């Protein structure tokens, strides 16, 4: 990806993405500091499509 696209992505404050590892980034096999709505996806019954 171009460096300019990456500058944009770095300045954006968006939560870390789903898909991989997805379900296992909700789960205890990951950092205790995650605060992603993506883990809340598996509580609320939400699904985020790719």
């Amino acid at each position: 990806r171009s460096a300019i696209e990456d500058l944009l992505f770095d300045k954006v404050t968006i939560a870390d993405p789903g898909y991989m590892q997805g379900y296992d980034d909700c789960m205890q096999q990951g950092p205790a500091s995650a605060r992603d709505l993506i883990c809340a996806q598996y509580v609320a019954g939400y699904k985020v499509l790719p």
């Binding site: 898909y19 991989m20 590892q21 997805g22 379900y23 296992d24 598996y42 790719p50």
Partner: protein, 726 residues
């Protein structure tokens, strides 16, 4: 009662031998819901070629049913001998929303004699007999299937052309091989083709009489007969029960060919059926004249929802069992038997829950001793006990008094006894039961107007009770008394200010009122202090006569909390065997009476220390500080998203498990979603899971082909191809 005819010619019974092992055959018959098999037609209505959904009592699509086979008994040479039957007499089942049966399906084919298979005889349609009732138990010999009071007797009699139903009491017989006799084995009925069913005289009492030979009918309330024609075509029959009586359904009368069942008849019996069993029967056919019979099946009905395909001819031809499979879910959601191709979202997995753990405790038993002696207070004098840090068993207290009124607001009484709390509060008082008409937590009576009120912020309960003659350490008030007025006069001598009692507070008027009211209608006054602006306190009261046994009431309220919940029911923690820090994948839990489920991990600490519970900005528990010296945290559990790939052009499908990855995938699951996944297994019983960049899938096959438009794309670069055209 019903003229059932003469009693049995003899008390003796033909001996019954159990030959069950001969009947151990495996011929399962699943329901072709696509053919409307087992479908009971809707009550009183009909439709055109339109399709609709419908809810009612139906069999599951995958139900193979229970199989029973009737056969000839023992006979040798040219004569009948002893009865050879299956152990069906022991098959007592609970009645469960009705059932339907399959009769004569294998007619016009061959099978075996079973009891003497060494014959391989052709098979024919044979009719079943049944018994239903509200109670069962053992015979004097410890045998199964004895029914009580009145039972519903259902049987064909002689040939299938006659059907009889009875509602009557069965009396055991003391003869040889008979229910009350001491040579009894097991009850059975029989038919004798040599004389029964004669071409010029069918024995309309054949079966009834052979029944009578084992039991004596007493008090026969109901009796019905039906005329039936002989036709080897498959018939359906079912039984349900409502407050309107017993309902009999059959396909024969209306839909002999489609198999839809119609309410053939109803019965006046209103007694609830609790048990259901099948009656054993044997044929007395001569050894060389033996005839095999077609298999018979039973299916159970349940309050299920279906998509129904009505023919313009008014018959149901196809149906969809919505809860069977995720695929069926989609058909129901689109009310169609042909869903457009695409990828669709379906219900997710429940993430497989496991055994509970707790951190409840600790405390000592509650010393309820203030209630065990002395005289209880007047309605404005209440005693209160605050309970914290302690354990209880309220039924011990219940044994001490007779309760004449128990009502709880906002909580079941059972739950309030079992719940654990930050506090438990009990208010107690003397109270004549003559005044019980004026007391409820919501009552408009003077007792609640001026003497006591309870907050509705907390769940409450109320108890009225009286003292047993062996509880004399508790004593009576000279009279029961209450304040029937509480107001203050305005200082200007023209107006008056009423004072209703505040919830959870003594009325202000108690400061002037004596400990008992000396006479009914007594009133009292006190001048108000100048800080109050002057005026006069006023109160009045009334009394009720003393009674032989002391009468009293109680008020109960409870208080919710988290780490303050030290009041609990007495608890036993034996054989958990472990609590916090043990997993599991999802586990049930309770911490100090706070229910939930989740998985725990030994993470690091955050403050404030010793507050136990830790919460999110959405008031979701985050974690728990614990007595192992370890902070633990809680992840709840993680659900699995599901999706289904579908292609109506090939009529095929495949599935997606979301981002879960193949490390949590197994061929079957307890996780769980819908009752089957077998339609996927039609190809995927032979293949491993396949990981993909979005996540693990089944049945997609890695061909590594490049196609610019699959019309089934899965996102990213994933794609999938329908199999090729016909």
């Amino acid at each position: 009662y019903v003229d059932v005819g003469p009693d049995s010619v003899k008390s003796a019974c033909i001996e019954v031998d159990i030959q069950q092992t001969f009947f151990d055959k495996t011929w399962p018959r699943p329901i072709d819901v696509s053919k409307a098999d087992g479908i009971i037609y809707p009550q009183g209505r009909t439709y055109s070629n339109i399709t609709i959904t419908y809810q009612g009592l139906f069999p599951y699509q995958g139900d193979h049913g229970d199989m029973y086979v009737y056969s000839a008994g023992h006979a040798t040479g040219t004569t009948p001998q002893k009865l050879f039957v299956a152990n069906y007499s022991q098959d007592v089942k609970q009645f469960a929303n009705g059932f339907v049966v399959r009769i004569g399906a294998a007619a016009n084919s061959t099978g075996t004699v079973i009891i003497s298979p060494s014959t391989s005889a052709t098979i024919r349609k044979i009719y079943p007999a049944f018994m239903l009732g509200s109670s069962v138990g053992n015979f004097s010999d410890g045998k199964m299937g004895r029914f009580f009071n009145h039972t519903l007797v259902l049987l064909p009699d002689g040939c299938g052309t006659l059907l009889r139903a009875f509602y009557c009491i069965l009396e055991p017989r003391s003869g040889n091989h008979c229910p009350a006799g001491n040579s009894y084995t097991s009850f059975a009925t029989y038919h004798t083709p040599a004389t029964d069913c004669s071409d010029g005289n069918y024995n309309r009492n054949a079966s009834l009489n052979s029944f009578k030979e084992y039991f004596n009918l007493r008090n026969c309330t109901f009796m019905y007969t039906y005329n039936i024609t002989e036709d080897e075509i498959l018939e359906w029959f079912g039984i349900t029960q409502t407050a309107q009586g017993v309902h009999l359904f059959s396909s024969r009368y209306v839909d002999l060919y489609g198999g839809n069942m119609f309410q053939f008849a109803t019965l006046p019996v209103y007694d609830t059926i609790k048990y259901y069993s099948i009656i054993p029967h044997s044929i007395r056919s001569i050894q060389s004249d033996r005839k095999a019979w077609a298999a018979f099946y039973v299916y159970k009905l349940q309050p299920l929802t279906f998509l129904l395909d009505f023919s313009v001819d008014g018959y149901i031809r196809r149906a969809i069992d919505c809860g069977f499979n995720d695929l069926s879910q989609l058909h129901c959601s689109y009310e169609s038997f042909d869903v457009e191709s695409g990828v669709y979202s379906v219900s997710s997995f429940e993430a497989k829950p496991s055994g509970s753990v707790v951190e409840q405790a600790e405390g000592v038993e509650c010393d309820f001793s203030p209630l065990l002696s002395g005289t209880p207070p007047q309605v404005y004098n209440f005693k209160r006990l605050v309970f914290t840090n302690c354990n209880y068993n309220l039924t011990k207290l219940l044994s001490l008094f007779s309760v004449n009124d128990f009502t709880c607001s906002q909580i079941s009484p059972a739950a309030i006894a079992s719940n654990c709390y930050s506090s438990l509060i009990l208010d107690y008082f003397s109270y004549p039961l003559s005044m019980k008409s004026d007391l409820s937590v919501s009552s408009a009576g003077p007792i609640s107007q001026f003497n006591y009120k309870q907050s509705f912020s907390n769940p409450t309960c109320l108890i009225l009770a009286t003292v047993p003659h062996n509880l004399t350490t508790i004593t009576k008030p000279l009279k029961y008394s209450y304040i029937n007025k509480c107001s203050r006069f305005l200082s200007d001598d023209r107006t008056e200010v009423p004072q209703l009692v505040n919830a959870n507070q003594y009325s202000p008027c108690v400061s002037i009122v004596p400990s008992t009211v000396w006479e009914d209608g007594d009133y009292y006054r006190k001048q108000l202090s100048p800080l109050e602006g002057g005026g006069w306190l006023v109160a009045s009261g009334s009394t009720v006569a003393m009674t032989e046994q002391l009468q009293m009431g109680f008020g109960i309220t409870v208080q919710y909390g988290t780490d303050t919940n030290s009041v609990c029911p007495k608890l036993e923690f034996a054989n958990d065997t472990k609590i916090a820090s043990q997993l599991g994948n999802c586990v049930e839990y309770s911490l100090y009476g706070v229910s939930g489920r989740g998985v725990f991990q030994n993470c690091t600490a955050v403050g404030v220390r010793q507050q136990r519970f830790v919460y999110d900005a959405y008031q979701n528990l985050v974690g728990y500080y614990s007595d192992d010296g370890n902070y633990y945290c809680l992840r709840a559990c993680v659900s699995v998203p599901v999706s289904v790939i579908y292609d109506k052009e090939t009529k095929t499908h495949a599935t997606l498990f979301g981002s879960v990855a193949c490390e949590h995938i197994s061929s079957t699951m307890s996780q769980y979603s819908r009752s089957t996944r077998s339609m996927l297994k039609r190809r995927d019983s032979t293949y491993g899971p396949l990981q993909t960049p979005v996540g693990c899938v089944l049945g997609l096959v890695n061909s590594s082909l490049f196609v610019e438009d699959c019309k089934l794309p899965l996102g990213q670069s994933l794609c999938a191809l329908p199999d090729t055209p016909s």
